[PDB]
Design a binder for this molecule. Structure first.
Ligand SMILES: N#CC1(c2ccccc2)CCN(C(=S)S)CC1
Ligand SMILES: [Zn+2]
Length: 257
């Protein structure tokens, strides 16, 4: 099965998922000097005050913080987006070392990790339908750098011991994802894909320019998770990122000058 090892990693994925070599794959390098300011882009609207988190799951490739998406409770709109996109979950991609871990890069710079807040277009009724559409998802990508602690991340860090291995989940109610956002909502946007199999080309990417800072202790706790199941040889959950893919026939737009 696919993963991030030498024998089943990103360079292998195309064999089971031929779309891996498609025309709008993610992540990509964001060349800041080539991205064009688009004055017609609207400001983002991130409405998370009514978010209802439910559970945290180690799915064997990352951990997902899941939300109740059966009503418009936490939504993303505006920016490049037409309509309303509901928050379903967030997860991260991170490295074994502070110098790698992000999927998107900025002028080839890699960050220590990258947060993906995943939202689906409500005009498609459910997430499974939405991923089959070119405008089905909007993913808000936020870079993490190591420095000062992010206080709003700590509740996530502290539950990881309870979901160390693949398939473990834990109750995770009343978590406020507003505590994971940087001050500025300036962003780059482009059409792309999921960055894990099934690699579906259904994502409007919205990548924030301003990283959040997390502490070395916080990211060290991510790196204590396991890709393996309980009672299996330990394989640390690290370097669960896909490298940058060809930009092909796409332009990255900036919301800012
Ligand atoms: N979990 C999960 C994802 C998934 C998994 C199976 C089918 C469709 C989507 C959605 C969010 N993902 C990205 S934003 S990288 C990871 C893959
Ligand atoms: Zn992701």
């Amino acid at each position: 099965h696919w993963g991030y090892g030498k024998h089943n990693g990103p360079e292998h994925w195309h064999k089971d998922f031929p779309i891996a070599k498609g025309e709008r794959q993610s992540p990509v390098d964001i060349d800041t000097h080539t991205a064009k300011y688009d004055p017609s882009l609207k400001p983002l609207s991130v409405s998370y005050d009514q978010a209802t988190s439910l559970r945290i799951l180690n799915n064997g490739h990352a951990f997902n913080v899941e939300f109740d998406d059966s009503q418009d409770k936490a939504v993303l709109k505006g920016g490049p987006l037409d309509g309303t996109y509901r928050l379903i979950q967030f997860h991260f991609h991170w490295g074994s070392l502070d110098g790698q871990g992000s999927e998107h890069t900025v002028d080839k710079k890699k960050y220590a990790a990258e947060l993906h807040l995943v939202h689906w277009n409500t005009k498609y009724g459910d997430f499974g339908k939405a991923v089959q559409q070119p405008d089905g998802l909007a993913v808000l990508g936020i870079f993490l750098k190591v420095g000062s602690a992010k206080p709003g991340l700590q509740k996530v860090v502290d539950v990881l011991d309870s979901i160390k291995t693949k398939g473990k989940s834990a109750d995770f109610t009343n978590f406020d994802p507003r505590g994971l956002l940087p001050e500025s909502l300036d962003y780059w946007t482009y059409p792309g894909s999921l960055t894990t199999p099934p690699l579906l080309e259904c994502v409007t990417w919205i990548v924030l320019k301003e990283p959040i800072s997390v502490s070395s202790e916080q990211v060290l706790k991510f790196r204590k998770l396991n890709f393996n199941g309980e009672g299996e040889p330990e394989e640390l959950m690290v370097d669960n990122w896909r490298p940058a893919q060809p930009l092909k026939n796409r332009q990255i737009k900036a919301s800012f000058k």
